[PDB]
Amino acid sequence: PFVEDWDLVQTLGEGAYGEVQLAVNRVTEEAVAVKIVDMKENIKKEICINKMLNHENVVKFYGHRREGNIQYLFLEYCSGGELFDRIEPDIGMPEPDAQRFFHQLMAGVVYLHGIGITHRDIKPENLLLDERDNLKISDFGLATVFRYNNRERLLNKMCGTLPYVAPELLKRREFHAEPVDVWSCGIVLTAMLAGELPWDQPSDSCQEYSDWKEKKTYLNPWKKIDSAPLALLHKILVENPSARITIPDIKKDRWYNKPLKKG
Ligand SMILES: COc1ccc2c(c1)C(=O)N(c1nc(C(=O)Nc3cnccc3N3CCNCC3)cs1)C2
Helix, strand or coil, X not given: CEECCEEEEEEEXXXXXXXXEEEEECCCCCEEEEEEEECXXCHHHHHHHHHCCCCCCECCEEEEEEECCEEEEEECCCCCEEHHHHCECCCECCHHHHHHHHHHHHHHHHHHHHCCEECCCCCHHHEEECCCCCEEECCCCCCEECEECCEECCECCCCXXXXXXXXXXXXXXXXXXXXXXXXXXHHHHHHHHHCCCCCCCCCCCCHHXXXXXXXXXXXXXXXXXXXXXXXXXXXXXXXXXXXXXXXXXXXXXXXXXXXXXXX
């Protein structure tokens, strides 16, 4: 119905996380997003993490309010919707659009990693667009601290979404946070340029993944991707996280720096 001065007008999504509604102030007409969670900390950590975020490519956190067993997180509304909906199945989107979104995604991720936070569930469904089609990273429910007091801590928990998770997450007891988020970004880039995900999961039991390791790029989705961006994907989707390209080096990539124009 409504929270304090805000009216909940439309459902922007629902799942195990609860539900997200578009809240409109009856007085000012201002619009924000409200995440409603049933208590039925988990949310405490998410709240603490959101409180430390301040970046143009990260969904802003305005505050929260508790009402019994119900917790309300006030977040930045993104009228452009989910990046997922800009990906035409089997087609993808124009390369210039994909490059722009990728640059913005990198900016957001560099920001997070800079403050010692890893997102852990980067995928098109969690990447939102504002009124100017600027990309914003959302959903910090799986986010965690991987660097504190200049000391890195390896991760061990299994979390994320199979098609987007890095292989080491499935094979190693402990692993570095950063290369996992980098890998997810590479899968997102693949989806944007091909309109399809490369594999159900990055395992040996997965034929699609095995095909990629053997470099069978004459197959989909790789055959749909231009040589320049494909060269970047060859550097990102590297099984060994230690050999995987880092963000500083992604920013030096030929395709990343290629001027593109639609149309
Ligand atoms: C215009 O159409 C839409 C459609 C969907 C959405 C919006 C606009 C919009 O602003 N949404 C917003 N979602 C958030 C947010 O923090 N969401 C969010 C937070 N916590 C867990 C899950 C979340 N979402 C589930 C749905 N996919 C995106 C992430 C902030 S704004 C979701």
